[PDB]
Design a protein around this ligand. Sequence first.
Ligand SMILES: CO[C@H]1O[C@H](CO[C@H]2O[C@H](CO[C@H]3O[C@H](CO)[C@@H](O)[C@@H]3O[C@@H]3O[C@H](CO)[C@@H](O)[C@@H]3O)[C@@H](O[C@H]3O[C@H](CO)[C@@H](O)[C@@H]3O[C@@H]3O[C@H](CO)[C@@H](O)[C@@H]3O)[C@@H]2O)[C@@H](O)[C@@H]1O
Lengths: 220, 214
Amino acid sequence: EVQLQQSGTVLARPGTSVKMSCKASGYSFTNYWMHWVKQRPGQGLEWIGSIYPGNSDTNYKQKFKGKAKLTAVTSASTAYMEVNSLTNEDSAVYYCTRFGNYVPFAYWGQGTLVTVSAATTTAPSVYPLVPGCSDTSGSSVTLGCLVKGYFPEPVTVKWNYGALSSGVRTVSSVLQSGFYSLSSLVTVPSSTWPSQTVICNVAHPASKTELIKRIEPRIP
Amino acid sequence: DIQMTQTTSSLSASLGDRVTIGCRASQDIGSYLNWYQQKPDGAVRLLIYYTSRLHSGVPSRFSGSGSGTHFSLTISNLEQEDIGTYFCHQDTKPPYTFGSGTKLEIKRADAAPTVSIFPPSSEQLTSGGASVVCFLNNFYPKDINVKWKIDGSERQNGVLNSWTDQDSKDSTYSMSSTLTLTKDEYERHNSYTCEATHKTSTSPIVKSFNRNEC
Ligand SMILES: CO[C@H]1O[C@H](CO[C@H]2O[C@H](CO[C@H]3O[C@H](CO)[C@@H](O)[C@@H]3O[C@@H]3O[C@H](CO)[C@@H](O)[C@@H]3O)[C@@H](O[C@H]3O[C@H](CO)[C@@H](O)[C@@H]3O[C@@H]3O[C@H](CO)[C@@H](O)[C@@H]3O)[C@@H]2O)[C@@H](O)[C@@H]1O
């Protein structure tokens, strides 16, 4: 019932600013402190500050004074954070979270990923992973999609628009020479493939791309 | 600021066993210590607040203890669903501070990988690139070694290795090793082999193909 819905991923150049949102529902927005938390890989969790939307009172961890700015708009039931003078150290997942009453951070947003870089957005290239011509058969088969050369994060992969979730294995992205790659594999019954359409759906929010790759037997 | 230190950054334990995750404060924080669990999708959940009080839908297996400077979250009998990263949090007053987290893995019965090898697709080849993928499926423990041989010779350059998160249901891992070459490099050789070395066997699991398709 209580929900905190944060805005989508952002790519930003060094020295610029970003403003992210946290829309609250299922409670009286103006009667609870909204806090912001920074998660940078290898830096645990860091408290930035909080705001009480009822009277606009704010507090900050000293280092974020003049760096992050917290606002709230009552009519929109939405809390905002604006972070200026962006550096690579500002690349992180940022969470909004509600405090109280007589409990601490009981409700969390899903997090907003910020990537600070001078590199422009690059959509992934997608290639099928298909068993070789001279491969040993069997009741099951493993198929996949190679997702290559994208920037920034993230990429999500689904199979058959989400209908195929069992036997799915998607490895973590790896960063190499400025670009990301990952791979997703699925093991399905030998009577489902090549009998049915097996598609991997590759989404890259930053480029607003929604790609499909049909997995088809090799050319005889 | 109050420095929050967690006992260890990673922990591995068997199902049914008692698990303790520790946290220490640089000053006395009384009972103002909270525990959060983060899942691999980044979702954060409050489990324990005010040192020892359980929160919403938190199983009775969880308990909390504290002296004011030293704290721990205890799971009485580890369950499959307990996988994740656990963070402590002091909220005595601003500025709030957090522990750096303890990643909890399930210790599982040893499982050998199932290995698959994937030649480059015609689609990639026609565009000038060639990736060869070795996929190692559903193994435990996580530690695993992949060796590439091209025409019998070891290659280490242009290889990218990556793992899945531990399987939320059966606690296994999977991983892929991707060998990147140009089409011209790829067409200059015939045999493509990956050898998977895992503690489950002293002999490597070997998968190969010949570019000649024979
Ligand atoms: C059991 O331990 C757990 O509870 C602790 C949290 O408990 C507090 O939650 C309620 C709200 O607390 C916030 O609001 C207060 C006033 O603004 C702030 O003290 C507190 O904000 C936090 O402190 C920083 C500002 O100093 C902010 O950054 C941070 O968010 C407190 O309860 C009071 O609020 C509710 C509703 O308003 C009232 O019921 C209660 O107030 C009391 O009742 C009278 C008015 O109704 C008033 O006279 C009394 O104050 C509660 O203390 C959590 O840390 C532990 O895990």
